[PDB]
Structures are given as structure tokens and as C-alpha cells.
Amino acid sequence: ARMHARKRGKSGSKRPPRTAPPIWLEYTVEDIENLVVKLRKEGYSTAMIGTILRDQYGIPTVKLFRDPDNPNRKLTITRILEKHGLAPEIPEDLMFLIKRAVNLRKHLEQHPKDLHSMRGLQLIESKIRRLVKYYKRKGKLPKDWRYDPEQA
Amino acid sequence: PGKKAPNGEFAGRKLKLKRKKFRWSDIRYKRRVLRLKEKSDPLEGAPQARGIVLEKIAVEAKQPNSGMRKAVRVQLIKNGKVVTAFCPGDGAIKFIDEHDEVIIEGIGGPKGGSMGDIPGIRYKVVKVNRVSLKELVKGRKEKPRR
Amino acid sequence: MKRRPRKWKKKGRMRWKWIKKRIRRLKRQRKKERGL
Amino acid sequence: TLLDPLANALSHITNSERVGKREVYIKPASKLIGEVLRVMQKYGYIGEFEFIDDGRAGVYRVQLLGKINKAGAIKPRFPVKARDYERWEKRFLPAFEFGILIVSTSQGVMSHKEAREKGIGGRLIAYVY
Amino acid sequence: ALPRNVIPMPRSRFLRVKCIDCGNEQIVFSHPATRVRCNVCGATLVEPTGGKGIIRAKILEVL
RNA sequence: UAGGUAGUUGGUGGGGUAACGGCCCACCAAGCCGAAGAUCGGUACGGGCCGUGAGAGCGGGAGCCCGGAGAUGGACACUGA
RNA sequence: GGUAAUACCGGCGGCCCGAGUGGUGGCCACUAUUAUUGGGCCUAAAGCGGCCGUAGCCGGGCCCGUAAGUCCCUGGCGAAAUCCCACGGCUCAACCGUGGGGCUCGCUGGGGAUACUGCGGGCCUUGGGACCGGGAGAGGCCGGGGGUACCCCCGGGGUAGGGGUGAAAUCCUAUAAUCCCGGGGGGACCGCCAGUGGCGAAGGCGCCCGGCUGGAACGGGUCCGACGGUGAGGGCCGAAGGCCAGGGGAGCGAACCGGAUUAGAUACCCGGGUAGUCCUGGCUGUAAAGGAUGCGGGCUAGGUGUCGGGCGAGCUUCGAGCUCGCCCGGUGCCGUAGGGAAGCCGUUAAGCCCGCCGCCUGGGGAGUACGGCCGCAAGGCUGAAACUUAAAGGAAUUGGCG
Ligand SMILES: [Mg+2]
Numbered sequence A: 001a002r003m004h005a006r007k008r009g010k011s012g013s014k015r016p017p018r019t020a021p022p023i024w025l026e027y028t029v030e031d032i033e034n035l036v037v038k039l040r041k042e043g044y045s046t047a048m049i050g051t052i053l054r055d056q057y058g059i060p061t062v063k064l065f066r067d068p069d070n071p072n073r074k075l076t077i078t079r080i081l082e083k084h085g086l087a088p089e090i091p092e093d094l095m096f097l098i099k100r101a102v103n104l105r106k107h108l109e110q111h112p113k114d115l116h117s118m119r120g121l122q123l124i125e126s127k128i129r130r131l132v133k134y135y136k137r138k139g140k141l142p143k144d145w146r147y148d149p150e151q152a
Numbered sequence B: 001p002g003k004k005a006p007n008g009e010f011a012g013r014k015l016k017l018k019r020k021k022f023r024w025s026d027i028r029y030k031r032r033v034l035r036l037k038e039k040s041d042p043l044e045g046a047p048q049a050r051g052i053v054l055e056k057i058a059v060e061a062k063q064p065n066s067g068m069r070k071a072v073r074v075q076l077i078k079n080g081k082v083v084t085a086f087c088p089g090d091g092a093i094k095f096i097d098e099h100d101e102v103i104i105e106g107i108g109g110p111k112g113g114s115m116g117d118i119p120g121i122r123y124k125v126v127k128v129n130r131v132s133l134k135e136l137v138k139g140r141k142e143k144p145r146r
Numbered sequence C: 001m002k003r004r005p006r007k008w009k010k011k012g013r014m015r016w017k018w019i020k021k022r023i024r025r026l027k028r029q030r031k032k033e034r035g036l
Numbered sequence D: 001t002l003l004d005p006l007a008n009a010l011s012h013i014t015n016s017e018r019v020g021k022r023e024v025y026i027k028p029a030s031k032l033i034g035e036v037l038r039v040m041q042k043y044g045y046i047g048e049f050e051f052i053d054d055g056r057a058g059v060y061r062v063q064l065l066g067k068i069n070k071a072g073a074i075k076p077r078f079p080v081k082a083r084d085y086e087r088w089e090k091r092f093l094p095a096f097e098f099g100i101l102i103v104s105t106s107q108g109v110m111s112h113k114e115a116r117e118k119g120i121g122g123r124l125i126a127y128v129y
Numbered sequence E: 001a002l003p004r005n006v007i008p009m010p011r012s013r014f015l016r017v018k019c020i021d022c023g024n025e026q027i028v029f030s031h032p033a034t035r036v037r038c039n040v041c042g043a044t045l046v047e048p049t050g051g052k053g054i055i056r057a058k059i060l061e062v063l
Numbered sequence F: 001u002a003g004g005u006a007g008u009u010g011g012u013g014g015g016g017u018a019a020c021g022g023c024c025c026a027c028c029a030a031g032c033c034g035a036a037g038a039u040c041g042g043u044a045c046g047g048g049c050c051g052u053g054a055g056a057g058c059g060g061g062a063g064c065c066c067g068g069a070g071a072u073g074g075a076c077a078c079u080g081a
Numbered sequence G: 001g002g003u004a005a006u007a008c009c010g011g012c013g014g015c016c017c018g019a020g021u022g023g024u025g026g027c028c029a030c031u032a033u034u035a036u037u038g039g040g041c042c043u044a045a046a047g048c049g050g051c052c053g054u055a056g057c058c059g060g061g062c063c064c065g066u067a068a069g070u071c072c073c074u075g076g077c078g079a080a081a082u083c084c085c086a087c088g089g090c091u092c093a094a095c096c097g098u099g100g101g102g103c104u105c106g107c108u109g110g111g112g113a114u115a116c117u118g119c120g121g122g123c124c125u126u127g128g129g130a131c132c133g134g135g136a137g138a139g140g141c142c143g144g145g146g147g148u149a150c151c152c153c154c155g156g157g158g159u160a161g162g163g164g165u166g167a168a169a170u171c172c173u174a175u176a177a178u179c180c181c182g183g184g185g186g187g188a189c190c191g192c193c194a195g196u197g198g199c200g201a202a203g204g205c206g207c208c209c210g211g212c213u214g215g216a217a218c219g220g221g222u223c224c225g226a227c228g229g230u231g232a233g234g235g236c237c238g239a240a241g242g243c244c245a246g247g248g249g250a251g252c253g254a255a256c257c258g259g260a261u262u263a264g265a266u267a268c269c270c271g272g273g274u275a276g277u278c279c280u281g282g283c284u285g286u287a288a289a290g291g292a293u294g295c296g297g298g299c300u301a302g303g304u305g306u307c308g309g310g311c312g313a314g315c316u317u318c319g320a321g322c323u324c325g326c327c328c329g330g331u332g333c334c335g336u337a338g339g340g341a342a343g344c345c346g347u348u349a350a351g352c353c354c355g356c357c358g359c360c361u362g363g364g365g366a367g368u369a370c371g372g373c374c375g376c377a378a379g380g381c382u383g384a385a386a387c388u389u390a391a392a393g394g395a396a397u398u399g400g401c402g
């Protein structure tokens, strides 16, 4: 079920099993790497780069090609960005959650009796800490980092 | 309710602790480990005892009954307590006199308490002046010291 | 007060809302009258 | 959440065959699941089975024959010495050779009747009869 | 036979639409999440509405 | 019955012992146990074994053998392997 | 057992064990009344009022290593007595001797194998999370505009009652009431539409317009890559009532003052009325806080309403419209297998499985006494024993009765 509520919900995306790219594609690997890098410099989130490739350029998910420099891995957007040095400086899951808990914290400063909104804040911060524990454990975040709300 | 709480492989400590915790909601175990029977018991863990009778009395029986049961007041020797004891048999009370020494057993009821329609009494007389009472009631032997 | 719903059953007793109110008055008298 | 993909399979099998079904789908498919199906087959409890890939861990199709009374998982996974089998066979099964007791010995998965012939032990994972 | 519950399969397609005031040929998605506009001229091709887009050009295939 | 310890934990140099050791002493530090129950109370000689039960277990450890300790209560020395 | 005793006390018959046979106290079995094997928690004892999370227990698929857990073989140990067997000596036997095994279930030196657990690398996407799109909703907090009803006051008209009850009376009225009309002010609440309808973790939320804000469902060849479940000790939220300070006060009204009914009437009924109920700032932390049903995952016939999204057809006064069929998520009913002591539950389980935490152990004494920690007080939380009793409880039958 959901993490905090307990509704089930099932909506999502259902993919076909497939190994090789489809026959009617024509974009070669380098023509797709340049497309991936061109869009990031328009200010696009790594989730909203794939939406546009799929909608407009007609490329089903980019995880159909292998990594050019490595036969083990498969291609993923974040593994293209770090090839050119454009990848984010903090996992953007964490960044979206943290940015969404900063203008709720200045709304709660003019309406301090809005007691039903300040529970969503506690729930957001629970999620932020759940993610920081994991990131610190996997070495993606330096150990001298803490979520201190009074900054930003 | 779910399945049952610590059914894991490395959960021995919590399972033992849950058992030791709920064993105290008992009454036969708490009463045997804290030793509550002694410290409140006029006879002190004995099967029998001896006393010296103070006065002879009669009790009324329970509700769906009628009649008077004869008994005595015994003053123990090892403690100094005063208990109430029952004289079993047809005409026994005519053999008990004051300033006599009597021997005392339990009366054998549920949980060690009392039995039948005599509800508050929990001891019975077996020997008078070192001469069994059962004999005296049915002839067969004579009572010393008057 | 940690009460038990078996006693609100009224068969062979008096009402419990009114036994509570009477226990409270004694827990007071034992307190003021030198409960110190 | 999900904690045991083998228990789910065995309860699914014994729930389905009790109402008369002739096919089941064991959705999350380990290779321990496949290894236990292999020995449920050789003793004549199920029919034939195949592994279908679906891009995410694969599925198992198995046809039932209506030849089992009960199947389940021995969960805490106790260990057994090679001379202490009857103590457990008297706890799970209904007569002195009624059915099999599946053991995870150091040479694969097998029934206790073939562990006693080599004289080895291991962890008990399940039982069928 | 082969229930949907095992091996799920989508319900949405890739099209081979063809522009109007540009003649250009493209591939698009049927349930888009953005506003699909042409890759030379800029006129829209599909529109986002809830479930399935409402296309605005000529279709050649369903791919 | 929630905090306990100040020769208490450790180091350097010594005395004493049949012998190693804060076992004692002179200096330098601030360590040491603890909610996985320390500290403080309660009861108790420990085991091989013994009673009971279909077994899992629950209860007892006077008498026989093996270890420990005591000689009305508390302190202290002589002779000797 | 009450003057007709197979139940007390004697006689005579009979029954069970027998050199013994009865009485009182203790431990085990009885007892699945301590439950690992192997119990309970809707109505009988028992789910924390609700939710968040630290330790701990439980944890998705594949590939390559290691060999700690685990399994097999082998050296050194776990005194004798005691325990089981066969044979031999006292007449057999109890007892004693020669041999085989068990027991002290626990230690340690090595060699072997990797299925599962643990530990170290790599690779995934189903669980969980992030994001975009078109919609639904009394979810919450500020600002502003209204709606009728009720009470009070001032003017105009009229003239003797009004009010209340089972029946009356206290009360209001000649300083002109009740009733009708023209105006001035004042607090609280938002009717019909309204729906086993919607939203929220629970307590709860219903006039309309504008602003900021939280969560969920559907559509999705988007992104991350096991980031998860439960949660002792700690933390926030919590109707009504009560408390401490400032404001306000129309209707209703614990305390209180009078009229009646009555054997009494400290009550029900009638005429008044203080605190309270409302607003700003805090404390208290309780309910039949109830679905008397803790939370996550998998599976096991159908039928039929209804709210939200999507899809496919057919109409159309082309409307954000109407009808039919299907997929996903909420909310109701009749019901198979199965479960239950029944009442009854039945894919929204009280069914068959895998987890984690909280509580229960005959009825009273007693939620009491004594101690501790919180609160300004009222009070909350923790919580025994001496003694006493043979039943107390539950779900359904036949009658008798209102
Ligand atoms: Mg002693």
C-alpha cells in the first residue's frame, strides 16, 4: 500500500519484454547521446528528458542500447550525463523533496494555526531522512552532511 | 491478530522473555516462588500441631441446612496464636475439657481451606491428652487425667 | 481510572457512574485529612 | 511486504488443487522454487512445468493432477543430523512412509529418503504428501 | 489462455503521423504527456488530454 | 531498585611474595561497568545424580562419591615440608 | 435428615486390597489452566483513541568469490557409583561379577562439500519513492460579501387580556400587553437540494466569491534502483466538560429563587435565572474515543446497485449531455467452499498461509492501599496482598408475563 496512507492504487506503466531495439528506429547511439545532452542545457529534469524523447522524437526508453564503453551495463540517462559532466550534484529525488519543504515552511510562518498542513511537513521530513540514511550508507553523500532546515 | 510474535530463527531471547513475563499472571506459581503461604500461616508448614483449649463453642450451619456444629478454641504453643478447631464425631464434645492438650490437623477441603457447611473452620481435633479421639467416641478406650 | 466494561452491566449491582463518584470522595478525604 | 516466495507458491498450490483447478501460475520464480518442483514431480504429484520469461523474474506454469492432500513450508528451517529423521517424520507426515520431506542438503535439494541412503543432513525447507 | 495477469502488455501505440503545413513525417506517442509540435515548423501534432491524445495530422501506420 | 565507581580504570619507577598481579606505595592521566539489566535488595553450599511424565518438559539437590567452607561470635601469632 | 432415611447410629449380609490399611501436609501428571512442538483477544477475561519513528526481530530476482553458521569423516576429553541388555555366583530373586551400549547434549586439533543463512564485489525492475498530463472532493488557514429566523429599543393603529398545562398556578398587562405596520441596533447558526453520497490517521468537516496549502485515485515502452514491513523506550494530534488571564452575551441553561403533583417529592411538569456555551493566548489528555474487529504481503465460485478516472460502441434539443459493455480504485447488499458454541462472517473474512508488536489467565477484595513521576488545581499514568466465595459470564430454545 502507500507508505503513509494505506490506499492501494495500481496505476503505472506496463512494458513489453524485449532485448534489442525495434526495427523501425533510426537514431543511432551517438545521435541519441547528443540529443540527451542538448536537452539538459535547456534546464530539463532527468525524468522529463525521457518523456520528451518518447513523445516527440519517437525513441522508446533508452535502456535498449548497451553502454558504448562497457559491455556489462546498459545505457541510462544519468550514465550519459556523468559522461559529459552535467549530472546533478545531489540525487534529484532528495532535491525535489527538499525544495518542496522550503516554501511550505514559509507558508507555515504566516498561518501557524493551519495544523492540518504542518502534518504534511512532518511526513515530508520523514521521507527526506529515510533517503539520507540510504544515501549515506551507499557513499553517494559525504558523512558531514545533515538536513538542517534553518538553511536554504 | 496476526500469526504469533517471535517466530524467527534468531529470536530466542525475546521468546524466553515473553514466557517469563506472562508466567507471573498465574497464581499457583507466584504463590510458590514468593512463598506467600508461609508468613501468614498459623501452623508454619507443619502437618500437625498441638495446643491448649480455652473455651468450647457452637457454630451455626449454612443456609440450606440447620443445626449446630461443636468446636473449641485452641491456643498454639509454637506461636501463641488462637485458632478454632472442630471435634468430629457423635458426642465427642463431652470428652474435651478446658485445660486439655489437643492435637490439630487440617480439615481437608478445597485448596486447603474449609469443607462443607462449616465454612469458617479449617482445623479438626485428632488427639486428646495423648489418647486418640476416634477411640474415645466409640468406647474401646478410657480417658486419662480425669 | 482504568475501568473494565464488565461492571457497566447493572444486573446485580448499582450504577458505576455513581460508584466512581463515591470512590473519588474517599480518595479526597484520605488526602486532606492528614494524607501527608 | 513480501518475505518468502516459496511459501506463497506452496500455499497457492494447496489452495488451488482443493477446489479443483488444473493449472496454476507461480509468479515470482526463483530457482529454488524450480528445484522443489523438480522433486515434487519425480514422486508423482504434479504434471509438467515450463519457465516463461516476462522481463521481470519470470513465471512458472504447472499442471495439477489432483494427487496431493497437503503441501506447505517448514519455515524456521531447522537443521537435521543424518540419523535423526524419524523424529521429524513423526511430526509432519501421517504414517511410516507417507509422502516426502524435502531437505536442502549440501549436494542439492532432495527428499529425506535419498539423504538417508548417503547418510547426510541439512536444512528442512518443505514437505509434501 | 495466457491471462493478462502474466506477461502484461500495453494498450498504447507508436504512430507515423505526417504533418500538414510542413509535409514532414514523424513518430509520436498515442498517450503523450506534453505538447507534440513539429520538428521543423512548429505546428502542434498531438494534444494532452487525460487518457489518450487527440491528434491533428494524417496517419500513415500504427507501427 | 537507574544510574554506579575515586586505589576506582590505566601508565611510568619500585617494595613485598614461593610466585604474576593496584596486591601495596611515589608521581602522570581520566579512564572503567550499564536497559543485551550495571548497582542494591531476596533466597541459596556447587555438581554426578533423584521424583514425576507418551515425549517436549516441570520440581528437588539431607544420607553414597567428588570439590568448597566451618569448629560458642570477632581479631592474632609460634613450630613445621 | 422435618415420625414411612438404600445417604446419620447399631445388627446381619456383601465389595476392594491384604501383613497391612486409612487421615493431614508437599511436588509431578490430570491441565492445550503457561501453549517451541501446542492456547486465546466482534458478542464470554483480553487490540494501546489515532499516527510518526530510534534499537531489535523479519526481508525481492540473477552472476562471481569466502568458508563464520550448518552437514559428513577422523584424533584428545567429559572419574567411579547410578541407567539398559545378555551371560555367570549366593535356592531363584532383590544384591554382586565379567563384557556391549547410553549418560554428563557440552569443549577442543585437523581433512572434505557448498544447497540455504552470514560476509565481499558486479547486474536488474516487479515492491517502495520522484515526475508530467486532464479531471473529483463539507481536507485545512486568512480576507471579503450575504440569508432568513429570534431578542431589545423608538414612532403609527387598536383595546382587554396574553401566556402555560393532564387540569391549574406562579409570571407579563391599563405607566396600554399579545396582534399588525414603518424604522434603529445586537450576538449565535448556515434549512430544504442531502444521497448504507464525498474528504480526512482518528477526533471531525455543509451559505457564496478571491488568495496560499496537504493527501489520494486514474492514464504513463518517463526517472531512481530494495531505498522495504513492524516497531520496546521517546515524540507530535486528540469531542464535550473543567481551569488561569483579557473581551463579549442574543437563544438555551448545572447551581439557585418561586408555582404545582404527591403519604414525602431535595425529582419528572411550569415561570425566571449565575457560571458556561462564542472570540484571542495557554494548560488538562479524558469517552459506549465503537466496525466493541492492530498493521504490511500472496492465494480461494458467482450475482447485483453506486461514486472517481480511462477505453469501445450507439443516440443527440451538438451540452462539461443521455444509454449500454469492459479495466483499475473506493463504498453497500444476497450468497458457494470453508470456519464458528451459536448469533453470523464469506476477495472490504471472523477462510488457508508468511511476519512484527501490544494485551489475557475463576468471581469479588480493586482500579483500592503503600510508593514514584507528571498537573496551578480538579485529576492522569503505574499498581499489589490478607481475606472471602462455587460459580460469575456468553449465544440460542419452551413457556409465563408487560
Ligand atoms: Mg544458607
Ligand SMILES: [Mg+2]
Pocket (backbone or CB within 6 Å): G039, G040
Ligand atoms: Mg483458553
Ligand SMILES: [Mg+2]
Pocket (backbone or CB within 6 Å): none
Ligand atoms: Mg470484553
Ligand SMILES: [Mg+2]
Pocket (backbone or CB within 6 Å): none
Ligand atoms: Mg534471497
Ligand SMILES: [Mg+2]
Pocket (backbone or CB within 6 Å): none
Ligand atoms: Mg561415567
Ligand SMILES: [Mg+2]
Pocket (backbone or CB within 6 Å): none
Ligand atoms: Mg545358581
Ligand SMILES: [Mg+2]
Pocket (backbone or CB within 6 Å): none
Ligand atoms: Mg540371574
Ligand SMILES: [Mg+2]
Pocket (backbone or CB within 6 Å): none
Ligand atoms: Mg554392579
Ligand SMILES: [Mg+2]
Pocket (backbone or CB within 6 Å): none
Ligand atoms: Mg509505546
Ligand SMILES: [Zn+2]
Pocket (backbone or CB within 6 Å): E019, E020, E021, E022, E023, E024, E038, E039, E040, E041, E042, E043
Ligand atoms: Zn510540421
